[PDB]
Amino acid sequence: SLFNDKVAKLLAGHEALLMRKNEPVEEGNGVITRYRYPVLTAAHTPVFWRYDLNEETNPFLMERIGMNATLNAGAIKWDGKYLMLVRVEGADRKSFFAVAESPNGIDNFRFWEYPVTLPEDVVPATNVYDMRLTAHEDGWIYGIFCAERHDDNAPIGDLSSATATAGIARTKDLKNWERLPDLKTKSQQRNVVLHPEFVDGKYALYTRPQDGFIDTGSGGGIGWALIDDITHAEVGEEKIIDKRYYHTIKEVKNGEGPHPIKTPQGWLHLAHGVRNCAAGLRYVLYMYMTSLDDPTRLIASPAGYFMAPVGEERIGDVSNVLFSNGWIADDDGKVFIYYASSDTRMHVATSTIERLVDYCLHTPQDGFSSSASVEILKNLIERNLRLMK
Amino acid sequence: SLFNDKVAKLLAGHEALLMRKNEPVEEGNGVITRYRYPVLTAAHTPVFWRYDLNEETNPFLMERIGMNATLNAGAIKWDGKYLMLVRVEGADRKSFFAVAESPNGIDNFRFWEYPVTLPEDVVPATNVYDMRLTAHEDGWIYGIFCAERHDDNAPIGDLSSATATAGIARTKDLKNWERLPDLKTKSQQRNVVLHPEFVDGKYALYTRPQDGFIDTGSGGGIGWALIDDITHAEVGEEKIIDKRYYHTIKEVKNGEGPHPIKTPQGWLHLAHGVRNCAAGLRYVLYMYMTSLDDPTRLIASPAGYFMAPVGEERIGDVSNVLFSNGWIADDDGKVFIYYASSDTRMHVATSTIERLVDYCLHTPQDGFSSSASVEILKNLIERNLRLMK
Amino acid sequence: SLFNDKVAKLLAGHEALLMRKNEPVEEGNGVITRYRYPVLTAAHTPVFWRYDLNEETNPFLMERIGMNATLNAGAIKWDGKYLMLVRVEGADRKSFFAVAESPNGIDNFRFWEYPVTLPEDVVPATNVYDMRLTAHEDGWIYGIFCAERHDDNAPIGDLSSATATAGIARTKDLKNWERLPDLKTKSQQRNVVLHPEFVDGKYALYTRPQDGFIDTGSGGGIGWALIDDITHAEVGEEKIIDKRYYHTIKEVKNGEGPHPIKTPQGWLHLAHGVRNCAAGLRYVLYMYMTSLDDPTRLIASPAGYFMAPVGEERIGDVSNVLFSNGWIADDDGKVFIYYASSDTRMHVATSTIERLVDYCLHTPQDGFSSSASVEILKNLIERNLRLMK
Amino acid sequence: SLFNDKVAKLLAGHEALLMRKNEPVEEGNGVITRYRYPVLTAAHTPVFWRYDLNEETNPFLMERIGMNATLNAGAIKWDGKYLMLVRVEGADRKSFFAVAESPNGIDNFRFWEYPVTLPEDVVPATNVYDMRLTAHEDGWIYGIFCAERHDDNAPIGDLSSATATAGIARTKDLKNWERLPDLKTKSQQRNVVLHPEFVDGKYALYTRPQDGFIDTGSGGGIGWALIDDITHAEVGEEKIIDKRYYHTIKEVKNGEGPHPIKTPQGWLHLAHGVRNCAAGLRYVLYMYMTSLDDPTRLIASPAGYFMAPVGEERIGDVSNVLFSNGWIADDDGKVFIYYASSDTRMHVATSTIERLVDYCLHTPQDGFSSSASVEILKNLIERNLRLMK
Numbered sequence A, B, C, D: 001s002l003f004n005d006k007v008a009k010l011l012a013g014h015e016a017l018l019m020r021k022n023e024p025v026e027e028g029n030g031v032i033t034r035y036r037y038p039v040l041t042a043a044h045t046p047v048f049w050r051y052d053l054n055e056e057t058n059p060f061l062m063e064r065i066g067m068n069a070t071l072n073a074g075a076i077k078w079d080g081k082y083l084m085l086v087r088v089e090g091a092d093r094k095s096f097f098a099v100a101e102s103p104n105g106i107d108n109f110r111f112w113e114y115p116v117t118l119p120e121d122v123v124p125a126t127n128v129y130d131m132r133l134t135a136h137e138d139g140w141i142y143g144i145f146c147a148e149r150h151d152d153n154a155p156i157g158d159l160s161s162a163t164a165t166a167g168i169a170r171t172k173d174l175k176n177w178e179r180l181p182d183l184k185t186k187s188q189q190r191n192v193v194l195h196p197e198f199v200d201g202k203y204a205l206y207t208r209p210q211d212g213f214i215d216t217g218s219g220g221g222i223g224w225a226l227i228d229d230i231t232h233a234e235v236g237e238e239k240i241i242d243k244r245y246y247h248t249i250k251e252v253k254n255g256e257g258p259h260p261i262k263t264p265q266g267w268l269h270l271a272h273g274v275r276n277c278a279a280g281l282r283y284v285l286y287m288y289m290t291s292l293d294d295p296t297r298l299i300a301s302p303a304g305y306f307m308a309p310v311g312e313e314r315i316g317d318v319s320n321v322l323f324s325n326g327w328i329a330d331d332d333g334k335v336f337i338y339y340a341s342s343d344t345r346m347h348v349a350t351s352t353i354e355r356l357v358d359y360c361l362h363t364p365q366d367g368f369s370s371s372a373s374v375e376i377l378k379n380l381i382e383r384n385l386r387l388m389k
């Protein structure tokens, strides 16, 4: 029948999309390798999430539930596989979480047939997003995410003012999720991330204090907070680890991405930095390192951005944005960086621990002015010209 | 001569552009079919609107009047033809109206040789835009549009503050237009649209009360107002029909598009919804239905967006926008939806009354939260997996 | 060795990029001719600016200093060559100046091996940008640029508030630059430009008074100020030459681009105009002319924009922007216009003095309303239809 | 496993290829419509014909039996479906027959899982090829094909000398084939085709007498032979119906394609014509019509070719060739023409009975000289110019 042929073609086209081999982009900067195709798009969501496949109830074979974007994904190596914890945004503008897995880390990502069922905390949330996964030494996988609600303080007609809390959930199988109490804290928080080891016998969070839902106000950067009990999590002392600076890529706000990778040289961090421009907010990725002895102590601050939107990345629902809350480092040192572009699609970039540490240690630090930038550059030029002779 | 050859080539290239056959995009969602090419762009404006073709006064053969965009078009079936009432924006940043016609509804749109001459109301307007055409049962074609003027209240140096009124004009041939008094109302209005039938013997308008020129403030959504005399139009009672909601595609504002289509199941509406993001305002299209017995009563509210920017649509003068104020439904049920992308160009999408009603009735309603979205999705997945077994 | 082969390929690929022949775009408006490729991108910066080429210190051969954008360039004809004074933005978000030269004006631009060393004025600047070069009759090449600093008045957490001064430097070889005192003035200034001739025996500046760092506030447009001593430059009297207007392409702000070209008909100006839209600020180019007898007197005001973003130009770090602060007119009348798109890359457009003057004189003036625009257009249509008969 | 993933991808890629929607080529001559994609290529053969899918016996997953070409196909409408009787050539250079079916006639052709098992006649054949299917009024489907054998009457070392005979088989299900005795005839024969009706109570064959295996020699064209008993088929009298002509597209040889279609105007024929050129033999398609009352009598001979190689068709194993031995005419008059290009792939072209008859009746007959061609052309030009005036 025509209907059955149509269903068969939808399914076949979907498999062809899912199975497409990714290829590295030859042109690069020697630090990271980009790939020709996104690892996930809205079109990668299962056909059976979007269409009612029953001819009796959907004779025209149209989508019943539109999928809009696959973005800001957490990531974990899981039982031999490369997993993303995807933020999937429906056409209804709500996001939910969904696991996708790949055998190789760069292609053939496929969603688990059901998305994540995440129980509410005591106060229901309207939207949940941007989960960072941490395999903690306590044996649990934690997902720390943003739980967003309408601001009850808002005046008449204001249906946009919102509040953000840090949601905390844990699991041992990524299917059954236990919802713990939202993080208790004196300001708004987003980009909260669990450090994978106890520090002084306590849970350690990366935080991002902010005075408002979008603007950080007095918030100074990426913070560090020790928590006695993750099941009744409350911030007491909070220390800023990586600061915002005028006229850098992290001027207006910043935030930790995935939890950092442990290297022999220190903790290797991936974060985002924001500035304002005539087109709105511009988000790029950057890196820094902290000490193994004292994870609050910066030991590498390469100048500028690590990655910024290139080509197709520049455009989407929220253009001029890269964002990452997930990466995977294999035992052999290979690193798979999962980053969203423009709040619309997921990409992968690859590198190695050795290359990323090299980048952090030997990209000169920002001297914070045009004159300083020129002096650093002239020094490199001089070395190169002498060599090229 | 070289000049004459140049004119001949301008004219020939223009005809080739105008005559190009459109083709449907194979990949779609089963609800609407997109098309490979826009139905109108600035390049579709006549050569003789832009160039002075006289060698004596334009020896270099350069454009004398630049055309910037063809957007936000009304639409009507007219004497066997498919007509758009185009908003054409010049390089001078003023818009004017112009009729374009096609024999088939998807390609070969051609502007009438002269654009629309629209007389001023008592108070002159600086810009006019976004006309909705209504063939009213009273025998007139009405165009309801936005008439914009500088805000006299503005302080020194403020050359941007503006006010919007609903302009009302009528015609029986789309060439001779009678300008009626601007709509009298207690707030700013844009997206005002005439319902095609009398209701309780009165003219019925879709309205969109707004506290400011761009922000709606207390304005609750798309309104309904009965008007005794369209030639002295004044709003008295006003009822909100379709409301804004936090964390939907119509959070910050919304507005009726073209006048709705009458179906056996009810009035079928096409509207736009706006939210804010890091890149600015994002505009998408959505649908709803109201009762034939009581056109103020919602009877279908499919969740989320009906159409959102895809591909080339995402980029233009005002990126991240779809907007529609025109569609045509033929007697056989075929629907031609005319929508602008990014305030720059006009597109067509096709569907049928049956498919659009199916979409409105069977796309689940928004339960307004991530948890609710997940439950709806899990229900569909469960049905499909049982079927696919 | 593999490393040496990699270096050799980086260098070879760079030469292939630099040497690529540009080609004009056939489709145009008869006023300006666009070109297929940008004249500069970040990839055009020398390999030896970005990479450490020594295997001992960079064994992975990765970039040590990322380059982000090449934009807003000044321009001058210099000893037979076509020169841009490029604003180069590093990955660190600081800009610096750098000379690039071409033998023909449309391709084969190559950076001088060292960028510009620009001494600080008494108060150090954080960023410097957008230099206009003027070969003044006094025998010096002046560069007038923006010097930006953090606003000390800013409250806690505000790392974005900034102040702009007009920096002044001069040179006779484009390598050794003398920094003069920043322009003294009662308001913020950006887009300051030196007129190439003395007027009443005084230096003459194009100015752009603004109440704030981004918003002009009461600032009325492009100004004119006579300065007694360029080495102790201070504005006294200041006159607005070209004004902002509601509902034009220069509504919110405007600014002089390069210094104007002297023609037998008057001074030929290139400027930018800004308006706000749902996507942010939109920047286009426009032209005007002033009198040789009195350079403060407007003698041509063609309506609307001269150039606006087309195609690839629309997208970049700061999308929806064209900006020019450099052009070159050869003795034969050929004009090379150097314009940035989206704060990301540099383009060239070509025309002639005769064509640009024709465009300025015969593009109708803006009558400031939709009705006026329609009347101008109908007049041209009528002439053309009579001719085409 | 990696192996199972590879098999899954082979199968998925194959289904995507098989299900691809064909699209008509817009630009045409108004007689036939070509299509963007071939209906069959060697890649369309089943994955399980080429690969051993068992990891135990094919651990590298390589092809065990290469498929080289899908060409010269018969065709029949069968139980509601569109069927080709494909000549499939293996990498071993032998051809075999195989049924492929489509629901619509222009795409989604899929081979039946097993190819045709064709029993040998008394003398074994080395190759079999180019089957024409005839649903005869006697209730059988006949396949008339070429059976080729080596000719040992050849100099030593001559392994190219061959003899072609007409093989005859019949079936009622296209799976079980009965092999009848090869046609007995005084010359070599290829392109023998069964007429679908008895003529004076006898079977009627289109023949093509030829003195050699490749060259026709004295063979004058397409012949007609009445046969008493198709199960002991022997030609007696043989009349040429359509002749070769110097300096036409059928100079060196010609041959009937599929059996002709019955129309109210006569029998509608599709044939091939051959000439020699510097590159070898050139094959094109042409048409002719014969009388219903007397099928030996020509009643239409449009000049020149009907179709000749265009674009991709020009190149393959045997370039510069079109060949057809199959077409289908639906009850509504729509005609699907299945033609091979360059002995490599199968294409479809569509027309209607009305259009093909119009083409045959109104394309002027060949007057056989340049002067005559010019006079015919000048006559049409004269009519057109007077009309265009």
Ligand SMILES: OC[C@H]1O[C@@H](O[C@H]2[C@H](O)[C@@H](O)[C@H](O)O[C@@H]2CO)[C@@H](O)[C@@H](O)[C@@H]1O
Pocket: A072, A129, A130, A190, A213, A214, A318, A321, A323, A343, B277, B278
């Ligand atoms: O959009 C850029 C980045 O903004 C942050 O989150 C958004 C969130 O995605 C929206 O749904 C909501 O309306 O506003 C938030 C605040 O701007 C950031 O956490 C990222 O999620 C996002 O990529």
Ligand SMILES: OC[C@H]1O[C@@H](O[C@H]2[C@H](O)[C@@H](O)[C@H](O)O[C@@H]2CO)[C@@H](O)[C@@H](O)[C@@H]1O
Pocket: B072, B129, B130, B190, B213, B214, B318, B321, B323, B343, C277, C278
């Ligand atoms: O730009 C998006 C949508 O905004 C609305 O209108 C604009 C109008 O087009 C502008 O010329 C003016 O400056 O501001 C208005 C308010 O934002 C909307 O009605 C649509 O016309 C437009 O697509």
Ligand SMILES: OC[C@H]1O[C@@H](O[C@H]2[C@H](O)[C@@H](O)[C@H](O)O[C@@H]2CO)[C@@H](O)[C@@H](O)[C@@H]1O
Pocket: A277, A278, C072, C129, C130, C190, C213, C214, C318, C321, C323, C343
């Ligand atoms: O971005 C558009 C235009 O804005 C102006 O300058 C920018 C400057 O480039 C930024 O680095 C700074 O942060 O803000 C300035 C004010 O918006 C303008 O002078 C152009 O440089 C620029 O193309």
Ligand SMILES: OC[C@H]1O[C@@H](O[C@H]2[C@H](O)[C@@H](O)[C@H](O)O[C@@H]2CO)[C@@H](O)[C@@H](O)[C@@H]1O
Pocket: D277, D278
């Ligand atoms: O085909 C190559 C070249 O052959 C010569 O002429 C051809 C002629 O074009 C054919 O029509 C005829 O059948 O055979 C001739 C002899 O090969 C040569 O003079 C060129 O015309 C032609 O390009």
